[PDB]
From a paper:
RAF kinases are integral to the RAS-MAPK signaling pathway, and proper RAF1 folding relies on its interaction with the chaperone HSP90 and the cochaperone CDC37. The stability, subcellular localization, activity, and MAPK signaling of RAF1 depend on its interaction with molecular chaperone HSP903. HSP90 employs ATP hydrolysis to aid the folding and maturation of diverse client proteins within a multi-chaperone complex involving the kinase-specific co-chaperone CDC37. HSP90 and its homologs function as dimers, wherein each protomer has three structural domains. CDC37 facilitates client protein recruitment to HSP90 by interacting with the client and HSP90 to aid their association.
In this work, we solved the closed state structure of RAF1 bound to HSP90 and CDC37 by cryo-EM. Utilizing signal subtraction, focused classification, Bayesian polishing, and CTF refinement, we obtained a 3.7 Å closed state map (see “Methods” for details). Our final model of the RAF1-HSP90-CDC37 complex consists of an HSP90 dimer, the C-lobe of the RAF1 KD, and portions from the N-terminal and middle domains of CDC37. The C-lobe of the RAF1 KD is located on one side of the HSP90 dimer, forming both luminal and peripheral interactions with HSP90. The unfolded RAF1 N-lobe β5-strand (residues 418-426) occupies the luminal cavity. The unfolded β5-strand interacts with residues present on the src-loops and HH of both protomers of HSP90, and exhibits amphipathic characteristics that complement the amphipathic nature of the luminal cavity. The CDC37 HxN motif, a structural element, interacts with the C-lobe β7 and αE by mimicking the RAF1 N-lobe. In our structure, there is density supporting the assignment of phosphoserine (pS13), a structural element of CDC37. The electrostatic interaction between the phosphate (pS13) and HSP90-B K405 is the strongest pairwise-residue coulombic interaction of the complex (−171.11 kcal/mol). Among peripheral interactions, notable salt bridges form between R611 (HH in HSP90-B), and RAF1 residues, E425 and E478.
Author numbering:
A (entry chain D): 2 to 48, 102 to 137
B (entry chain B), D (entry chain A): 10 to 224, 267 to 689
C (entry chain C): 418 to 490, 505 to 615
The structure:
């Protein structure tokens, strides 16, 4: 029952880690911008053996943890206040 | 140096107490593990039949039966699964932390297309939470029927069975504890099955003792009626969406939500990768009467893993403003705790949370292309879209396009901001909007006179929440949101208009001083209006102060703090119409006499009217009423 | 039933440079304390702020103070920007001690109520001196009831040497010891 | 029949995996368990020395020392507690579900002062959450020094230790995994210890990086950091209340809450009986600026069991109207789960909730006897009292007596309801109250004219929350809460008054009918006013309908649909003053001519004015303003 895979997760918009004297939206935006910056510098540095280790050790994030398995969205056509 | 090596050991008696008392918080979860193990056995017997159908010669019916009996206090579960051999029963039931299911899967080849529930090997002992003595009846095809029994005293007894030949499967018998007799009431068994095991892969039967006369009255009375509708609603989310009809979606929604009306729309999507799950969402046709009530439950999105229920109201998966969403989510890889109630990594929930919000936004975007249905959606859930503006700063841009309002040129139709900008002139740079209580009030206000007469469309705000949303919604599509009720309302004017306005200021300069000294403190400045055409005067607000409709909303909230209301209180400015006849007469009279008491009374009454016309509540309605009573005495001659 | 309220507020810049609200000495000290705490937590999470000024910090309801409030919930303004940031010499001169200097200008606003280098009507001339080290915040303009500990603290923060500016836990330590001596 | 008996067994590797990955959601708990065990050893030697003082000859100082080492990644824990013999070493570290501490209290006789926390015998294995290998140095008084080492691979090594002599105690060295250097951060360690083991009754010294300012003639200062205590704040709640002074409470409150001011008041108590716990409560001197911000922690009372932190906020402890209360609760008898992060029995919490609510109400009752401190309390927390009126059904009786209000004869000082009960007229039967936006606006209302002239005291209502109170606060001390803004305002009347009333009705009946025809639907009826002297007419509401302020409060809410709640909106009744000269002259004009355009203009103007004086908004301010502008042209001869 190895659970080591999921223990590295980083989520910016987390209310649990918030400071009462900081604007929550601004802090979330700051965290998101920091995430964008770190993944953008990481790829530029990527383009080497030590480089290979840190990618495997990064906290998984929403963008990288999984991908979409496509399914259908529909609209229900039924007469409101029918005759 | 001499090193001694020893292997770790375990105390069985203390381990039993730990697994009994410190593992499972809720007693009712005991039934979930039993149904899970029965489904395990049924899947085992089914899978081998895919290669050798002759296995099912002992029995072809895959089912689970629950047979409560209040007379002896025995809660018995019978299933037709794989069964046990003696080696299997000893190895699995006698060894804590050993699960035969995990070994079975590890023995199977890669890609078996069968996923099972139990892995820890301790779920079975949860039966001791409510049972003091457990007897298990099982029979494997390659073996004989045996008897298994224990009282959780650290030892168990195994013996051969010569009773009724069960054929194939397992029969679990639990002698209920005396104070746990409430679990014999059929209602709670139905509730527990629907709550936790609604979507098991095999039909579950329930035999109930309803009638006491046996084969007596005119008709033949049967003591037991077999009830099958316990897991009838089959998990359509498991099937491919392309093969599901709209009627199937409606039936699933009605079964899940007990609604008599159909859904408005269905959103179905799955996610693949390290975190894999399937989701199926519904939009109710009517807004619930208690949608924003505080004392009630936050969310109605139910969580599943491998078709077993985990958590009903998980606060971490959706925000408040999307609480009306109905649906279920099922996964296959979530790391569960020892009780299969929480997750060993809570940040997983916040990863599922991020995608589902995006999917709901996509679904709401997919509703807007059909105006007729989207009109009903807007009518039922205008508030939820607006409330999400103020809190979800991340999705504010996308949610803005989903807004519709009455405008000065839309008539009775609600129109989007995109239509509003599309209908604007080349010279206009701002979205002129007006807040108020009703469409007719904001339409008939004296401020919109010059705005309307110059052909500029104005949005009408009538809901109280409109002031909150425009606070963050400073600009849309690069166009600033400008309220014409405030000072500095800029209109594109020619040189002649500017010259006429300047002549008005220079002509009325001293008169403005006369007003200002007459009113003293109530008005900060008196200026010649550039927004009025017919009405003599109006009260406009400061550039950054609270608007007229705003402070009324602020002054009416029950729990706000009054220590700050001094700071953002806007300062009142009195704009005056240069071309009004009454203002010209007052100018002449003031020039004739600066100390005319009649002029003072006219100015005070006119300002009192201006406050009322601008929407401001009077500081004292009584003095204005007394002034008007005095005046009508003069008009009548009293 | 009852309903909720939400996040609305107003900035220090508007309050003091426009409304000129007469904040009490303890109130100004409390804004100092909360700003220092919010800065420390920002630095505790190795986050850097680059445009500290009364415009970007807001007094919320109940006199709550919310850093990052770009609105109710460096565009010039160099009077807060530290000299080492001003010369643009380093590729990223922004640092924790640059934020210390900017927050020291914030304390200057708190304890004086007027923008630093007020005697100057040219921004570029202010640029030229404060960048070269010719101009310092005029610490004599602090209020007459100013405690000595805060005065020395703001002096340390506006010190032109970035390394000498004490790091934010030292700022909070300096405030609390004076803060407990306030009722004198 | 042959019955075979077997004893239950367990798989060691799977049990280790379950303990590691399944029981603890957060990894930071490993420090908590280590501190708990070190304190257990320290209390063991302390109790042993209480009987044999020579036991401490190997060491006199009792403490826990933490030696993080970022260079070697070794998190060294050294405590001067009891050492291990080889038999104790193996029996305690190699045996799962075996607690030497549990055996220790099971060995002790009844009556000993014991705060032991270690019971499950598995907390030590939590070190493997962050450490791949555990290194233990142990030295008991009756045994030599030994080495124990394992990597959770199912086996451990035991050998004699010949390194640095420890004398007595235990030295745990953890080889932290490379991904978990966070626990070597000094700030992280301080956060964890203050969060979990802040109130351990032994000095915790944490030794960290060098304190050197580098300029030998250079300054070096200390080539390390000697920090001597992180648990400086002693658990004063464990002490008796009588021996604690105000300064101690203030320092403790400032330590916990980081506040710079003192408490407003303190309440310290314990609860005995079938459950034992202690509770220390603080009320801040100032309202928390985010008291009703709902996105963050609702309840702010921290929970402790045997002086180790359990959980920070449980919604079953305090309601929303008590969110301002500060304090901590410590208990000794709650059975925690295996993870100690959640209480398995929620029935107990409700009893604690009841007791704490009762005692907080008692404390608030104590404050009221001292007016000035209670005046500060009321100013800072008036809203929460009224929310408690609204929601707390049971305590509404005592909660009502805590309300202070300005009255018509109270001047500027606010008065309690009981003070109003101190001042009835003998005939007066109802507590007359009037709602509004400001004290001045209600002080001189037209409705309170006759009420004031007859010497009846009235209460001024100015906050929006007040209308919720009068919805629930219907009667107080058996006296009804009657508003003078509503119809049916029954005031003690004599025979002459009713005779005059009947004469006025007879005289004005035709006038009443003609105004009823002119005003049509805008008024449900027109009646002669029994409450007006100076105002010719005013608007009153229905017997059961909303007041103008109440309706404004409902329609100003941003999250409620006014269409659904609109059925209750009161009907408007026009109460005309019989003795008013304006009313009498209008009666004469109407009798002389019923279709007079002047008469209809006067009556519509008078009704529009009466709406404003009654707090109602105008259905269209623009038409009223145009009516004024037209009229005053006649005054100017325009
Ligand atoms: N009805 C059954 N059919 C097949 N095997 C069973 C049945 N009941 C018990 N067992 C076996 O006995 C062991 C039962 O326990 P438990 O229910 O304790 O384990 P799990 O279901 O395998 O794991 P977990 O504890 O994670 O749910 C199972 O792992 C399974 O091997
Ligand atoms: N540093 C120590 N000093 C003294 N005894 C210790 C120490 N570390 C471990 N032990 C002993 O090892 C035995 C096991 O404990 P663990 O720390 O394994 O669980 P617990 O403390 O017994 O209970 P729980 O699992 O409920 O926290 C303990 O009961 C304690 O007697
Ligand atoms: Mg199981
Ligand atoms: Mg332990």
């Amino acid at each position: 029952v190895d659970y080591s895979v999921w223990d590295h997760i980083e989520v910016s918009d987390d209310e649990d880690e918030t400071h009462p004297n900081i604007d929550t939206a601004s802090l979330f935006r700051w965290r998101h911008q920091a995430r964008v910056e770190r993944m953008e510098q990481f790829q530029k540095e990527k383009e080497l053996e030590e480089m290979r280790k840190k990618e495997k050790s990064m906290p998984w994030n929403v963008d990288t943890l999984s991908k979409d398995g496509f399914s259908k969205s529909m609209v229900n056509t039924k007469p409101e206040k029918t005759e | 140096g001499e090193v001694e090596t020893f292997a770790f050991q375990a105390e069985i008696a203390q381990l039993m107490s730990l697994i009994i008392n410190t593992f499972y918080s809720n007693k009712e979860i005991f039934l979930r593990e039993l149904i899970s193990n029965s489904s395990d056995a049924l899947d085992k017997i089914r899978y081998e039949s895919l290669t050798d159908p002759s296995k099912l010669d002992s029995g072809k019916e895959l089912y689970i039966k629950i047979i409560p009996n209040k007379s002896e206090g025995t809660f018995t579960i019978i299933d037709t699964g794989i069964g046990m051999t003696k080696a299997d029963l000893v190895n699995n039931l006698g060894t804590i932390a050993k699960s035969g299911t995990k070994a079975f899967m590890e023995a199977l080849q890669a890609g078996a297309d069968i996923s099972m529930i139990g892995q820890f090997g301790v779920g079975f002992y949860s039966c001791y939470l409510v049972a003091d003595r457990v007897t298990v009846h099982s029979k494997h095809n390659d073996d004989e029927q045996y008897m298994w029994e224990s009282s959780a005293g650290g030892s168990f007894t195994v013996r051969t069975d010569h009773g009724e030949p069960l054929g194939r499967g397992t029969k679990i018998v639990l002698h209920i504890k005396e104070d746990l007799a409430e679990y014999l009431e059929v209602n709670k068994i139905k509730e527990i099955v629907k709550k936790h095991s609604q979507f098991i892969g095999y039909p579950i039967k329930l035999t109930v003792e309803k009638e006491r006369e046996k084969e007596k009255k005119k008709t033949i009375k049967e003591k037991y009626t077999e009830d099958e509708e316990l897991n009838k609603t089959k998990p359509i989310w498991t099937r491919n969406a392309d093969d599901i009809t709209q009627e199937e979606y409606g039936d699933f929604y009605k079964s899940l939500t007990n609604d008599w009306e159909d859904h408005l729309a269905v959103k179905h999507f799955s996610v693949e990768g390290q975190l894999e799950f399937r989701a199926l969402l519904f939009v109710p046709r009517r807004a619930p009467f208690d949608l924003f009530e505080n004392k009630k439950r936050k969310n109605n999105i139910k969580l599943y893993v491998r078709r077993v229920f985990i958590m009903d109201n998980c606060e971490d998966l959706i925000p408040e403003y999307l609480n009306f969403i109905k649906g279920v989510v099922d996964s296959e890889d979530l790391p569960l705790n020892i009780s299969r109630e929480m997750l060993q990594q809570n940040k997983i929930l916040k990863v599922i949370r991020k995608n589902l919000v995006k999917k709901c936004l996509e679904l709401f975007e997919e509703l807007a292309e059909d105006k007729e249905n989207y009109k009903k959606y807007y009518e039922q859930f205008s508030k939820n879209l607006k409330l999400g503006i103020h809190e979800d700063a991340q999705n504010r841009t996308k949610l803005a396009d989903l807004l519709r309002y009455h405008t000065s040129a839309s008539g009775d139709e609600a129109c989007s901001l995109k239509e509003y900008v599309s209908r604007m002139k080349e010279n206009q740079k701002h979205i002129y909007y007006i807040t108020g209580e009703n469409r007719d009030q904001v339409a008939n206000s004296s401020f919109v006179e010059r705005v309307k007469k110059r052909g500029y469309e104005v949005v009408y705000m009538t809901e109280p929440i409109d002031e909150y949303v425009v606070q963050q919604m400073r600009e849309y599509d690069g166009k600033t949101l400008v309220s014409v009720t405030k000072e500095g309302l800029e209109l594109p004017e020619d040189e002649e208009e500017k010259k006429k306005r300047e002549e008005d200021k220079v002509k009325f300069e001293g008169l403005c001083k006369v007003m200002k000294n007459i009113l003293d403190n109530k008005v900060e400045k008196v200026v010649v209006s550039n927004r009025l055409v017919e009405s003599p005067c109006c009260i406009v607000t400061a550039q950054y102060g609270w608007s007229a409709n705003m402070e009324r909303i602020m002054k009416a909230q029950a729990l706000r703090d009054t220590s700050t209301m001094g700071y953002m209180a806007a300062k009142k400015h009195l704009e005056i119409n240069p071309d009004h006849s009454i203002v010209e007469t007052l100018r002449q009279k003031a020039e004739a006499d600066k100390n005319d008491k009649a002029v003072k009374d006219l100015v005070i009454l006119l300002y009192e009217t201006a406050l009322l016309s601008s929407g401001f509540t009077l500081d004292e309605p009584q003095v204005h009423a007394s002034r008007i009573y005095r005046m009508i005495k003069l008009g009548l001659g009293i | 039933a009852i309903v909720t309220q939400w996040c609305e507020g107003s900035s220090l810049y508007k309050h003091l440079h426009v409304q000129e609200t007469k904040f009490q000495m303890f109130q100004l000290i409390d804004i100092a304390r909360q700003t220092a705490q919010g800065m420390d937590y920002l630095h505790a999470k190795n986050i850097i702020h680059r445009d500290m000024k009364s415009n970007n910090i807001f007094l919320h309801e109940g006199l709550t103070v919310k850093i990052g409030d770009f609105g109710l919930a460096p565009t010039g303004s160099v009077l807060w920007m530290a000299p080492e940031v001003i010369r643009m010499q380093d590729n990223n001169p922004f640092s924790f001690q640059s934020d210390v200097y900017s927050y020291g200008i914030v304390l200057y606003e708190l304890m004086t109520g007027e923008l630093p280098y007020s005697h100057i009507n040219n921004r570029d001339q202010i640029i030229f001196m404060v960048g070269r080290g010719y101009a310092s915040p005029d610490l004599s303009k602090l209020y007459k009831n100013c405690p000595k500990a805060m005065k020395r603290l703001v002096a340390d923060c506006v010190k032109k040497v970035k390394e000498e500016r004490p790091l934010f836990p030292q700022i909070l330590s300096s405030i609390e010891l004076l803060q407990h001596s306030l009722p004198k």
